[PDB]
Amino acid sequence: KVNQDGSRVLLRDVAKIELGGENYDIIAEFNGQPASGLGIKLATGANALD
Amino acid sequence: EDISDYVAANMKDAISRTSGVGDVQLFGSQYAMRIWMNPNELNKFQLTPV
Amino acid sequence: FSSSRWEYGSPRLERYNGLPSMEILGQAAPGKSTGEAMELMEQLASKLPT
Amino acid sequence: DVITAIKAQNAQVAAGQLGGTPPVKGQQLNASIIAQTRLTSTEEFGKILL
Questions:
Q1: Best mutation site among B34, B43, B47, B50 for testing chain A: the one with the most A CBs within 10 Å?
Q2: Nearest chain A CA: its distance from D19 CA (Å)
Q3: Superkingdom of the source (chain D)?
C-alpha cells in the first residue's frame, strides 16, 4: 500500500524473503555430512535389476 | 536446502519417469520463494497475511 | 499507466525431457553416411559452452 | 444469507502448528493447532448465527 503521506511499504519491509526449501520436515546426513538423495521405490511387478 | 533443490531441478525429474519407477522419495525439497511474514511489521502498516 | 516497448522473443520455444532444448535437423553427406555424420556432430557439440 | 452463513460457520479450516517445521533452535514441544471443526448434529446447525 501507499498510506496518505507518500510513504511506500514493500514485502521486503514487512517480511523476510529467502530462496529456501518448500518444506522443512525431512533432512538427511551421510556419515554426519549434510546431503540429499534419490530414494527410488520400484513399481508393482516391474523388472528390478533391469 | 541447496543440494535438495539441485537434486530435484536437475536429476529427480529424469527419474520417476525412466525405467519403470513407481515413485521417487526425494530426501529434501526443491527451492520455493519463501516469504517469512512479521506480525508486528504487518500490524505497523495495518496489514493482514491476506 | 502503461509503458510500451519493442523487445525480442521466441515464437516457438522447445523442451526435450523437461529441459529447454532446440532441434537441429541435418544430413549425412554425399560421401559419408550417418555413422560419421553423427560422430562429427557429437563432438562438434562437445566443443560448445558449459 | 442462509447458504453464506453455513460455509462460514460449518467448515474445517487448516491452521498450522506450534513449533512448525523451520523452528527456533531449542524448541521443546511440537503440537498441532485445531481451529474450526465440522458441525455434527441438528442442534449445532440450529445455533448458526445469521
A1: B34
A2: 12
A3: Bacteria
Give the method used: X-ray
Residue D31, C-alpha cell as written in the block:
503440537
Angstrom distance (rounded) from CA D50 to CA D48: 7
The per-residue DSSP string of A8-44 comes to: ---HHHHEEEEEEES--S---EETTEE---EEEEE-T
**Resolution of the experimental structure, in angstroms:** 3.4
Rounded CA-CA distance A50/B16 in Å is 15
Cβ neighbours around A14 below 10 Å, total: 17
Q: What is the number of other CB atoms lying within 10 angstroms of the CB of residue C27?
A: 9
Q: How far apart are the first and last CA of chain D?
A: 7
CB A9 within 8 A of CB A1: yes
Given a contact cutoff of 8 angstroms between Cβ atoms, the answer to whether A20 and B5 are in contact is no
Rounded Cα distance between B36 and B42, Å, is 11
